[PDB]
Design a protein around this ligand. Structure first.
Ligand SMILES: Cc1cc(N)c2ccccc2[n+]1CCCCCCCCCC[n+]1c(C)cc(N)c2ccccc21
Lengths: 185, 184
């Protein structure tokens, strides 16, 4: 539904600007529909959080797969592509990125929502289990591992954005920082 | 009670919504009026520099306060310090979110940065020794600080919402930080 879609887009800008606490009424006005129209698509605010996130994460992963040169047979060079695509996505889509960050840090994501976010780039689990330190694949510390990678990717992005001039150098500098910190001997 | 009033409001405000936090909102959250804030700080960029120096001074005092010299080995040294950083952040999440924002606005002046590094003279010297040259440079020093803050801030979040394993996160966090910006 272009109407569903409109709602997802309005939800993106509203959440980007105000957080998950963004009024379900304000979302509806910006989408041109009535608060009830929305309730028929997203039963609860939590189910919205979860559907947005999947839709944003989908988008994020389409960019990555598309930019991924499947002829790259080197793990580090492969990780470079993911790192590069992840950063470009955020730079070219500030709202989608702000929004997806809130959702992911909202504490309202179902485990169901998690497993659906993986099936969108399964061969990507393949990279980690090759390069990443055993402890960061650990059931106890993988969340932590991904976190470090993410905070590292976010700062690189802040810099690249605030100082366009040098982005390429930040992006490179940030990758090597993350490789030495997260990756195997 | 003067400028001290504003610095706290500025802290929370900048911690809540970033460096974009208005001088209006800061005064309200302070009690005084937007005009009052500008009494104590000529400009906003002057508030940024002063707030940074105020929080930094508070962090260093505490790191210095918690450093035992008996610990000679440089490795174990930095680990004891990193520990002191994590605790402070975990004790004052707002102060730490404000410091991090301020850490790389672009508005910190040079005398600000210099006066910043002369507050804990020996840590400075520690850094300058073991830390990738590019992260000491003028054009990437701030980025090196950003990366360091991101890693610490991530440790503080995990340690905080999963206390059961705070000692492990703090440890994995240290190592990751170590390999990331350190040396052999
Ligand atoms: C903004 C934002 C901010 C957050 N704190 C956050 C936290 C949790 C989840 C999403 C988050 N988001 C949004 C996150 C959306 C998912 C982002 C995943 C992009 C790709 C995953 C990267 N992947 C990871 C993780 C770790 C690796 N070692 C690795 C190595 C090689 C290749 C890929 C690799």
């Amino acid at each position: 539904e272009d109407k569903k879609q409109a709602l997802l887009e309005a939800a993106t800008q509203a959440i980007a600007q105000s957080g998950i606490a963004a009024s379900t009424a304000v979302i509806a006005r910006n989408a041109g529909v009535a608060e009830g129209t929305l309730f028929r698509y997203f039963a609860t605010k939590d189910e919205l959080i979860n559907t947005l996130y999947l839709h944003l994460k989908q988008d994020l992963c389409q960019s990555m797969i598309m930019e991924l040169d499947r002829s790259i047979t080197d793990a580090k060079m492969m990780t470079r592509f993911i790192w590069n695509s992840y950063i470009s996505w955020g730079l070219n889509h500030p709202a989608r990125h702000r929004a997806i960050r809130q959702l992911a840090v909202s504490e309202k994501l179902t485990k169901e929502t998690e497993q659906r976010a993986d099936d969108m780039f399964p061969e990507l689990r393949d990279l980690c289990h090759r390069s990443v330190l055993m402890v960061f694949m650990s059931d106890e510390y993988r969340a932590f591992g991904d976190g470090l990678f993410l905070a590292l990717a976010e700062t690189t992005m802040d810099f690249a954005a605030r100082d366009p001039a040098r982005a390429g150098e930040y992006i490179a500098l940030g990758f090597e920082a993350m490789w030495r910190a997260l990756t195997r001997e």
